[PDB]
Design a protein around this ligand. Structure first.
Ligand SMILES: CCCc1nnc(NC(=O)c2ccccn2)s1
Ligand SMILES: [Cl-]
Ligand SMILES: [Mg+2]
Ligand SMILES: [Mg+2]
Ligand SMILES: [Mg+2]
Ligand SMILES: [Mg+2]
Lengths: 194, 194
């Protein structure tokens, strides 16, 4: 019943473009929307985000997160490890790779989502969310070695799964970091579960 | 260490702008980013809200109330938490309750309100409050409720049991060609992981 009729390019950068979408609303009226797209997508999705469950015996399970400066935010943010899927990469493979580059941890795939939207009122951006467990007791994850690219500066922050929400709320109150909405949503459901 | 040096407008639509962001990396080098921003953000603590609406009813499993809408930037239908931008001077909590009633017909009760969290911080500055609201489904106010969609809003309400959310979302994606929101999916994953 609703559909896209055309897309007019407004402005194209190296990484991002702005478009004006014309679409048919369900009353049979023609309408417009300003839409953002990345210029990098081919793939299943633009990117992956990794939910990395650090499992170590006799310890609480941790969720491994990363803190970085985000120029669009003008501030530091706390996020799941994430990045863009290389052309010819699978989502699962991008997840292990990104997880290694950003944290040094080497992990195992548990499940992978279908492509899910990031901010669908604004952009077409999508990701796979890939749940990964990290055997924290193996020697490869003893002194994890982050292999970050040129210009990436990432701090690793592992927080306990069973108090995640309170821990994030603290980082926000006390560090003026911004927590990512997917990370916050995850933390909320850990509390809301039964 | 890192901070914004300058923000140079590239292209402004009525709703969205692209900016060339210049910032200082932690080595001391000047770098650039392409950044998206909304034009609508005021003194609001955030662009918007998303509502986690827990429908509670005697002798019923709790449900999460979701909405399905056409999203022009996506070219397709998306399943999301009820959500809208915060009006000038409106509180996040008022906005949440109001968007919830407008989009679903339900009258909720505030449970909790997050700090401002980032929607896609490598791309945009957009932020929301995630507002958890309970809905007393035994109250007559919430018996056979009508959405009051604004101008050009066409929303369908989908209520799924909290205890099976992830499988129910996976089934919808299997039978329907629709996209699930990344927040909704993250929340459904944590409900399983707990
Ligand atoms: C990032 C959001 C981009 C938008 N582009 N177009 C938008 N139109 C409206 O909100 C609207 C205007 C007139 C009648 C009905 N709805 S919002
Ligand atoms: Cl798990
Ligand atoms: Mg990354
Ligand atoms: Mg990378
Ligand atoms: Mg809305
Ligand atoms: Mg609305």
């Amino acid at each position: 019943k609703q559909y896209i009729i055309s897309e007019e390019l407004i402005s194209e950068g190296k990484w991002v473009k702005l478009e004006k979408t014309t679409y048919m609303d369900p009353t049979g009226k023609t309408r417009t929307w300003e839409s953002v797209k990345r210029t990098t997508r081919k793939q299943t999705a633009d990117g992956v985000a990794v939910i990395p469950v650090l499992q170590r015996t006799l310890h609480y399970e941790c969720i491994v997160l990363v803190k970085q400066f985000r120029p669009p935010m003008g501030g530091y943010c706390i996020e799941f490890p994430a990045g863009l899927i290389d052309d010819g990469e699978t989502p699962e493979a991008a997840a292990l790779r990104e997880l290694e580059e950003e944290t040094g941890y080497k992990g195992d795939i548990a499940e992978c989502s279908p492509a899910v939207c990031m901010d669908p009122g604004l952009s077409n951006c999508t990701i796979h969310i890939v749940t990964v467990t990290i055997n924290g007791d193996d020697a490869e994850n003893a002194r994890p070695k982050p292999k970050p690219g040129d210009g990436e500066f990432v701090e690793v922050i592992s927080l306990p799964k069973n108090d995640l929400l309170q821990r994030l709320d603290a980082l926000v109150a006390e560090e003026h970091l911004t927590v990512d909405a997917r990370v916050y949503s995850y933390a909320l459901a850990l509390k809301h579960a039964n």
